[PDB]
Symmetry: D3
Subunit: 143 residues, 6 copies
């Protein structure tokens, strides 16, 4: 009746992959400062990218019932969308194994988004993170 | 022109606090299973609560330019909202120091939300996390 | 003449498993509070279970000469034994590899036991942890 | 009704300290090898000492509801007791703060004991760890 | 006769600081690629900077007898020196406490240097890291 | 144009290995104290050895674009060289996989060197670490 992860012993090896997205909504001046170049913290996108990559590799340590796993590839892409007053985060994780990497992609997108928040905090106190969701995973889902 | 955290030496000691919220939107059956009792993973809320608390304490390790800090109190509350087909997460962090704890509260809410996602994954592939935002921080902001 | 781990290169892949047990001895009132429901800290068993699972995954980081390894399954079961004024912890770890998982099962049982201690500390200052030992490992040993 | 750590804000600063003990019981040949000098793994005591010290500093990360805290001193002492076919572990933790360090001393003793187990595993499959308990903490308790 | 850290209880609070330097020597083409812009890995300096900052905060976890400590400021500066076929790393750590931060500055410089190495590996197999040393610490030393 | 690790999916499995070296230069009295036996910190070599081994296993967490990987063997050897007023560190890492272990060997040598520095700090303020470089990796390079 309480937490207990599932066995992945008999699941066979395969090429797994997943992609997620995240958004940080902010004021025009706030985003403008990211493009211009930046807040007193430094390179916003570069720092969020690295944070997201490191976080993906530590997903097994942050999510109690996830399994550790040898990530073969992690990508974090950031794109300013001034027309929407926000930043778009897209992530990609891949590996050869049994277990999929949906949580690793979601975690990398979430932590990238938190890092953008951190670097812009002083300038705006009501930035909103979301939505955060899967785009594709690999039957399976795609986008 | 690149990442460089700010000095907190001369900032004085004070009682800092911050509260954040997060939501995980899902299908009725999915939420119903959390209330009933649960998915094959186990106690959803109890596991998300612990994940969120542990994550708050590791915020300095996940967010590159955050400073380590002696958290005096962390709370993660979860509440099923069947009328909205979603789960509400509310967090609270507190400590006596100079630096505020806005990122710790946000990170605990985000990781709690990721853990709910993880425990329900198998049942629904299009759950959405968000919004994720501050409610209060302590001038300052309140809610 | 000093620390140096052994090579596991030529060892072949196999289905490894191990089970351990641990006990926390306490006063009747202390255990009664775990059953009733609880100390001011919260759900004792649920929290000890998660701690134990997370600890098993970090065994390679806590024990200097252990090797990192892709755990396929970790279980932590807790059972109140009022007739003996104590809590029984039983763990199970499994994976497909060369290296066995005796230390992972032992570490998960030890940390679960420490967490029970932590949640009950205020109520009793002389709780005792032990014994802590293997039950089964997989020639090999069984119980 | 679920996990929630207590607030340590208003608790005042003080000199805290705690001592714990742990024992690993084994066969004469096994202990003899520790004294002689050692198993194929290397210096048993030296490795267990370091593991225990590092573990004490990470107690806040292993025990969900513990608070992080600036340890000012950690000691791990090991002593072969051939007359009892076992190893005795005694630990000491100290710091200036509000929160006591009972869990840090207990965790350092437990991980030291696990490391002794690890280094001797191959030679004996039924070593037993325990008891593990406090000796002193600082009203308070003493020994 | 074995590892045992010293007590920092009675040491008084003060403003501590330390600066270190590190160098990575390489071929002209290799450095040229860092300036131009880069290897297939990405922004070399930006990534080394973040790695170094994160590493400084984890020094207590990497160096067995160091004490954890609330860093108030960490800086990692990188500068291409084409005239010497190498990269210069300069770091700065600061905090208010008893314990100095010489190891944190040295560790941030070392890990920054390792990250530069990592990003350029494929292009040159004989890059050399060093020297790595203190410049200033705060009696005390200066440069 | 920013950090992005490469895919290791299609790379095939092989026996990888790498060796690195590091040196810590110091005064005769300082080295003499390591040989004699030691500083107030304890066993210098034994502590540096363990630090280096643990660090190798955490290389993926310290170097942003490295991939996690199941180390099958890590060795850290230390040798006093009184004729040169310095300590020589030689490391060896090995595993069966696609990715090589050059960074793991380099990181273990660097952290071993930092630990020697830490244990001798009080006695000499101008010790120098370096050079730090590969000796062999496995076409490939050898020494």
């Amino acid at each position: 009746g309480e937490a207990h992860m599932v066995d992945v012993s008999a699941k066979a090896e395969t090429v797994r992959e997943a992609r997620a997205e995240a958004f940080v909504t902010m004021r025009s001046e706030t985003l403008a400062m990211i493009i211009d170049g930046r807040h007193h913290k430094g390179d916003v996108f570069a720092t969020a990218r690295i944070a997201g990559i490191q976080a993906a590799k530590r997903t097994w340590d942050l999510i109690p019932l996830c399994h550790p796993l040898m990530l073969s590839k992690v990508e974090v892409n950031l794109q300013a969308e001034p027309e929407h007053n926000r930043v778009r985060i897209e992530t990609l994780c891949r590996l050869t194994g049994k277990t999929g990497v949906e949580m690793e992609a979601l975690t990398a997108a979430s932590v990238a988004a938190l890092t953008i928040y951190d670097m812009c905090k002083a300038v705006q106190k009501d930035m909103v993170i979301g939505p955060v969701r899967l785009l594709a995973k690999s039957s399976g889902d795609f986008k």
